[PDB]
Design a protein around this ligand. Structure first.
Ligand SMILES: CCCCCCC
Ligand SMILES: CCCCCCC
Lengths: 119, 117
């Protein structure tokens, strides 16, 4: 929705600012795992560590930051897959969240978002 | 090929080791821009900053780390687009290289590689 994209953009900009500058990072914030995770964290996607809930909320987010229905479904399919894989094991909840984001970024979901197709 | 892939895997592992541990990074090295850039740098892809040369070498790399012909072509199309866009402007050559990698990662190319899978 046009209300939530305004909000997410403001959150990306703020994450860009507060996140530590570290070596070898792309200038494009939407190419950065730490920015996406930071942004999604603020939208509450990871406020509850239950994998089923993270999955619900991620799929909801796909609808939203993407308009094309085909790409919306691809995002949902990928969110499900990434949550299933990356919430297994003994890593911390915060690191699992970061890994989920990395999995989605690697899969190409970021490219299909309105944030990327309106820079 | 299998020989090139053996070499790249060894380069990824070594980049994983030598690269600074920075906050909020995925455990998956193939999800990391700094690892990919580090790996591709070692294969000489950015050994000459001429955009035309970076493009030729990137497209060549697509054929080595991807087997599906359809995905090979997509990688090539994306490499071309990223080099064209991210080598413009006054940023340093090294940073332009990193930005190229970030552009390809964002586009999904990493997912289609044999290393990933
Ligand atoms: C999969 C739900 C949003 C992911 C953000 C793309 C990096
Ligand atoms: C410059 C080489 C393109 C392949 C990078 C994959 C992320």
């Amino acid at each position: 929705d046009n209300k939530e994209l305004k909000i997410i953009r403001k959150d990306v900009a703020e994450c860009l600012r507060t996140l530590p500058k570290c070596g070898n990072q792309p200038d494009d914030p939407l190419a950065r795992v730490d920015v996406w995770h930071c942004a999604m964290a603020k939208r509450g996607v990871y406020d509850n560590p239950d994998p089923a809930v993270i999955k619900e909320r991620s799929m909801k987010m796909c609808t939203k930051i993407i308009t094309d229905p085909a790409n919306v479904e691809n995002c949902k399919k990928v969110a499900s897959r990434c949550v299933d894989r990356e919430t297994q094991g003994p890593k911390s909840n915060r690191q699992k969240a970061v890994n989920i984001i990395g999995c989605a970024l690697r899969a190409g979901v970021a490219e299909t978002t309105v944030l990327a197709r309106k820079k």
